[PDB]
Amino acid sequence: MAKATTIKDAIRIFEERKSVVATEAEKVELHGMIPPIEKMDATLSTLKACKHLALSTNNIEKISSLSGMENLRILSLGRNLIKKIENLDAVADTLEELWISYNQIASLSGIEKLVNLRVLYMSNNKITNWGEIDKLAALDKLEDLLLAGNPLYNDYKENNATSEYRIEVVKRLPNLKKLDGMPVDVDEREQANVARGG
Secondary structure, eight states: OOOOSOHHHHHHHIIIIIOOOOTTOSOEEOOBOOTTOOOOHHHHHHTTTOOEEEOSEEEESOOOOHHHHTTOOEEEOOEEEEOSOSSHHHHHHHOOEEEOSEEEOOOHHHHHHHHHSSEEEESEEEOOOHHHHHHHTTTTTOSEEEEOSSHHHHHHOTTTTHHHHHHHHHHHOSSOOEESSGGGTTTTTTHHHHHHTO
16 A cells, blocks of 8 residues: 555555555555555445455554454455554454464454454564463464464463463364464374374
C-alpha cells in the first residue's frame, strides 16, 4: 500500500505509489505501508473479494475498518508492526491463514483471538507476557501455532523445552496438534513414540 483513505483513492494511489496491481482483488500483491494507516476503506469495500492480502514491510497505528477486515483469510505478511487492538478481533474471527514471518505485538485481547486462530506462522514476533499469554492464547485448545522467534518462546527455551512441549502435547493434551512444529528435532518420533507405546 501507499496511504489509507478511501478505496478508490487508495487503490489508484497503490497503482501509483506502491506501483502495483490491485483491481479490488482478493490477491493484492503489495510491498509496504505507513504506520499512520487510519480507516482501511480499501478493505471496507474490497471485503467482498478479500482473501490474499500480501504485504512485506508495514505498520499499523489505527484500524477503524474492523467490519471491513471481517472477510480476510490469507494474510501473506512478512515484516510488520502492530500496536493497538482495533481490528485483531475481526481479522481473527474470519482469518485462518496468518502467514506473518516477522510481527511486533503486545495486546492481550488481540493475541488471544489472532493466536486462538486455526493456523499461524510467526517465525519472528514480539510477545513476552507469559503471565497471561502462556495460557490466555487459548494454548490448550489451539491447533497450528508456529512461534519460533519471540521473548515468550525464547524464555521457555527455544531449543531445550521445545521437544518437551510437543512430547507433552501428544502424551498429555487433547486438542492442540502443532505446538511450534520445531519440537520434532528427530526425538518426537522416538521419545514420544516410546512414550505412546513403542
